[PDB]
Amino acid sequence: XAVLX
Amino acid sequence: XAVLX
Amino acid sequence: LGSSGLKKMAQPSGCVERCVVRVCYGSTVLNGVWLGDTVTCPRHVIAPSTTVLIDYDHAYSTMRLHNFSVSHNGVFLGVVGVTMHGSVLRIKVSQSNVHTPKHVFKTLKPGDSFNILACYEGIASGVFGVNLRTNFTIKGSFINGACGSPGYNVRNDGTVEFCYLHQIELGSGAHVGSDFTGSVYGNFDDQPSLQVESANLMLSDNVVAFLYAALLNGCRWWLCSTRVNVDGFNEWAMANGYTSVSSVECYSILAAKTGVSVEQLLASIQHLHEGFGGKNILGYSSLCDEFTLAEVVKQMYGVNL
Amino acid sequence: LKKMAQPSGCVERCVVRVCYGSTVLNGVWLGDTVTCPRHVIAPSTTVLIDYDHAYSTMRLHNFSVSHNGVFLGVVGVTMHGSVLRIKVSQSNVHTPKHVFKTLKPGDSFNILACYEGIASGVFGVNLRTNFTIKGSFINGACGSPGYNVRNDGTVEFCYLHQIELGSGAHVGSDFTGSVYGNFDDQPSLQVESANLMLSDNVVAFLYAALLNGCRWWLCSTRVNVDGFNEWAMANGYTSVSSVECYSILAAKTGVSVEQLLASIQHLHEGFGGKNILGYSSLCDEFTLAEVVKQMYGV
Numbered sequence: 001x002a003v004l005x
Numbered sequence: 006x007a008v009l010x
Numbered sequence: 011l012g013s014s015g016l017k018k019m020a021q022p023s024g025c026v027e028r029c030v031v032r033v034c035y036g037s038t039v040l041n042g043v044w045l046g047d048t049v050t051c052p053r054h055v056i057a058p059s060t061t062v063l064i065d066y067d068h069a070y071s072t073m074r075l076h077n078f079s080v081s082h083n084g085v086f087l088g089v090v091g092v093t094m095h096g097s098v099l100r101i102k103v104s105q106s107n108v109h110t111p112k113h114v115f116k117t118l119k120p121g122d123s124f125n126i127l128a129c130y131e132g133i134a135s136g137v138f139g140v141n142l143r144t145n146f147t148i149k150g151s152f153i154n155g156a157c158g159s160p161g162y163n164v165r166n167d168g169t170v171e172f173c174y175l176h177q178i179e180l181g182s183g184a185h186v187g188s189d190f191t192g193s194v195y196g197n198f199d200d201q202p203s204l205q206v207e208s209a210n211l212m213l214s215d216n217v218v219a220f221l222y223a224a225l226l227n228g229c230r231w232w233l234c235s236t237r238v239n240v241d242g243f244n245e246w247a248m249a250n251g252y253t254s255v256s257s258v259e260c261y262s263i264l265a266a267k268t269g270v271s272v273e274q275l276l277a278s279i280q281h282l283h284e285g286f287g288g289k290n291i292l293g294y295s296s297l298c299d300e301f302t303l304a305e306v307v308k309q310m311y312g313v314n315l
Numbered sequence: 316l317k318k319m320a321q322p323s324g325c326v327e328r329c330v331v332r333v334c335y336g337s338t339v340l341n342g343v344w345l346g347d348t349v350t351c352p353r354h355v356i357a358p359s360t361t362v363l364i365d366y367d368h369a370y371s372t373m374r375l376h377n378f379s380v381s382h383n384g385v386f387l388g389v390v391g392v393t394m395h396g397s398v399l400r401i402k403v404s405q406s407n408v409h410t411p412k413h414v415f416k417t418l419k420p421g422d423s424f425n426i427l428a429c430y431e432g433i434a435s436g437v438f439g440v441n442l443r444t445n446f447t448i449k450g451s452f453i454n455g456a457c458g459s460p461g462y463n464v465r466n467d468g469t470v471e472f473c474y475l476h477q478i479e480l481g482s483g484a485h486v487g488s489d490f491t492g493s494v495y496g497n498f499d500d501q502p503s504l505q506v507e508s509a510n511l512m513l514s515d516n517v518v519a520f521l522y523a524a525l526l527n528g529c530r531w532w533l534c535s536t537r538v539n540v541d542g543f544n545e546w547a548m549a550n551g552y553t554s555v556s557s558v559e560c561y562s563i564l565a566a567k568t569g570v571s572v573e574q575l576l577a578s579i580q581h582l583h584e585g586f587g588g589k590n591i592l593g594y595s596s597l598c599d600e601f602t603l604a605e606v607v608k609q610m611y612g613v
Contacts, residue, residue, distance in 0.1 A: 001502070002481060002501070004477060004502060007178050007179060007180040007181055007198075007202060007203060008060075008179055009052070009054050009201075010176035010179060011479070011482075012481075014451060018318065019451070021437070023322045136321060137322055138317055149317075151316075151317035151609055155612075228483070293449070295594055296595050309451045
């Protein structure tokens with residue numbers, strides 16, 4: 001779920 | 006009513 | 011995940027900060043902008059009083075150069091000449107600003123977004139984004155000594171558009187400036203007189219962009235099920251404090267990516283016009299006309315204009 | 316009340332373009348050291364990253380560090396927490412008087428949103444109780460600096476953007492590599508605690524309203540600190556911290572904090588259409604310091 005920019 | 010800054 | 015977030019921002023203030031100077035005449039102190047060998051600032055800096063009707067003609071003719079004091083970060087520049095143009099002064103100095111950015115001068119129109127570098131005593135203290143409203147005022151944040159604070163836009167190629175010098179706060183709290191050619195926006199007077207502005211209209215183009223941003227961020231509760239055509243909406247806008255919608259195809263990019271037509275966002279504006287009741291939209295508790303289509307697309311997809 | 320940022324100039328001159336292979340994000344250039352998110356060396360985006368493996372197989376000649384298109388020379392790379400410290404030959408002659416600070420929930424700071432090593436936007440933000448912030452970032456934003464500028468001119472570097480959680484919330488790390496709230500710089504399913512309303516800010520906001528002639532909302536009711544604190548339990552609000560700070564503004568209103576405490580309860584219910592300084596709901600976006608500074612220049 002988390003997205004690293 | 007207006008004021009000069 | 012499922013969004014990017016919509017946040018109100020100003021463009022970077024760096025290149026403009028290096029142009030802000032402290033301009034003092036007698037005991038009056040405000041801000042100026044230093045480009046080339048010329049400092050532009052509000053002309054009421056030479057007014058013996060700012061709290062009374064000013065005879066600017068007399069103010070300029072009894073002006074003496076040795077009462078001027080221009081500094082940048084405490085380093086004093088040498089005043090060489092002063093000339094009056096509209097509501098501003100152009101102060102010629104010996105030293106030329108070696109940090110003069112590639113720049114032009116632009117006059118804003120209602121609906122244009124720009125950036126304010128709020129300055130005091132020649133030092134920038136805050137930076138924020140604003141819209142020139144339909145009544146040629148802005149909703150900024152200023153206190154005593156803010157005058158001369160520059161408004162600007164930075165183009166893609168890096169050219170700085172200088173377009174605002176803060177000058178006035180009306181009795182309503184609304185703020186007014188001039189462009190760098192001296193023209194006071196909306197033809198207000200640079201006097202402490204009673205001046206009234208036109209009733210503000212909601213920037214309908216901006217609300218549409220805002221609602222698209224809301225959809226692209228997962229906010230959907232407000233979506234109306236009915237459609238309203240452009241002419242049908244413009245007839246409603248004139249009668250409820252909204253501008254006309256220009257022009258249902260600039261939104262083709264977001265209409266495509268959301269599957270919601272502009273007409274469906276127009277009927278929603280009508281319904282949401284009342285108020286949000288309890289609910290929210292991206293942190294905002296009423297319809298928001300603060301974001302242009304360009305601002306939205308920029309924050310969503312990273313492209314310009 | 317206007318949410319604004321402190322000038323970004325001094326910070327802009329520290330922002331650099333950091334590229335590894337073809338991966339490009341932002342770095343902060345202080346002295347001879349460039350700090351950037353370590354995931355710049357990550358081979359993939361949709362998969363759990365073996366940073367140890369990524370780092371031992373790391374090669375320096377694949378780095379490209381630039382400031383306004385001017386290339387610096389990479390000399391050394393060290394990994395510390397969730398960031399890399401890239402040693403460069405050239406020293407940043409525009410290194411501002413600075414320190415490194417780790418923010419606490421409730422602290423306001425400024426985000427300089429950067430892409431490709433060039434700043435594109437600047438805005439004010441608050442660190443929430445769940446150690447996230449609500450900003451706006453897309454592809455290539457990581458490494459964007461967060462900062463505060465003290466009164467003496469000292470720049471506090473305190474945030475490097477790294478991740479967006481599934482909830483939409485944004486998270487960064489400090490310059491020591493510690494990711495705020497102990498989130499991982501991994502694409503894993505990570506859920507944060509529910510956000511709480513910064514009640515200190517709400518109180519400050521209401522004082523601002525009083526100072527602007529907005530008084531309609533003033534409740535006739537009184538509520539003590541403890542009574543409000545467990546009203547706060549059931550409505551997503553923080554504890555009130557903690558009465559003695561508002562003694563100055565209590566006077567200009569004739570309103571006690573307790574009278575500012577009971578109104579929040581009543582207004583939480585709803586505004587009935589009416590507004591407070593343009594807001595149709597309670598606002599915790601402004602600190603007391605921000606209010607006083609915008610009101611009186613302090």
